[PDB]
Amino acid sequence: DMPVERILEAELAVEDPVTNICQAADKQLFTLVEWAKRIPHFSELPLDDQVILLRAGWNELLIASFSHRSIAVKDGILLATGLHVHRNSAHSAGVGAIFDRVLTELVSKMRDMQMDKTELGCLRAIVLFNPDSKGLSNPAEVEALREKVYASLEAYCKHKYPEQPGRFAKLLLRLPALRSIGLKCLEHLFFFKLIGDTPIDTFLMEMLEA
């Protein structure tokens, strides 16, 4: 069973600009583990599989969170550390193109449909329960948990937003964009790590290891 109430509870329980951004990401990696432990049945998976799912999904999970946090920011994002990054500052740091993709494909679309925190939490739990993650000991159990999440999300959307029958599908169809932006984010991060000119803290650095 997968009650949307517990998923919202997990969201609520955890509530060089590139250097600022990396610091915020490292801070939120610790909070991400706490969030994941509060998603129903995650902690019951084998420890190896919990590791695989969080290593595979952390960037999409954090991008979804800070994008939704930024709905009331004009042309920018709100970092977990309290700072804004405006698109002009992002451009000035050499990461303008991917930053604009976050604003246009995620933040503005979350703002336009007024995605709420239960929906964000369900989308993140779907991302977390990624049965394609390589090396999982039981992919079928992860797919089953994913199916429980989106069954609960759909019932929630249909009840709270009955005038928007397409809202459930509209939520899920942000996940390809999230995947693409996440992959590009990872490529930038591996390049920052290679160049050596950008401080990367211990947990973010660990996520960038083999």
Partner: peptide, 9 residues
């Protein structure tokens, strides 16, 4: 995966 394991325990 050292930090991640420790935090999951």
């Amino acid at each position: 995966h050292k930090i991640l394991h420790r935090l999951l325990q």
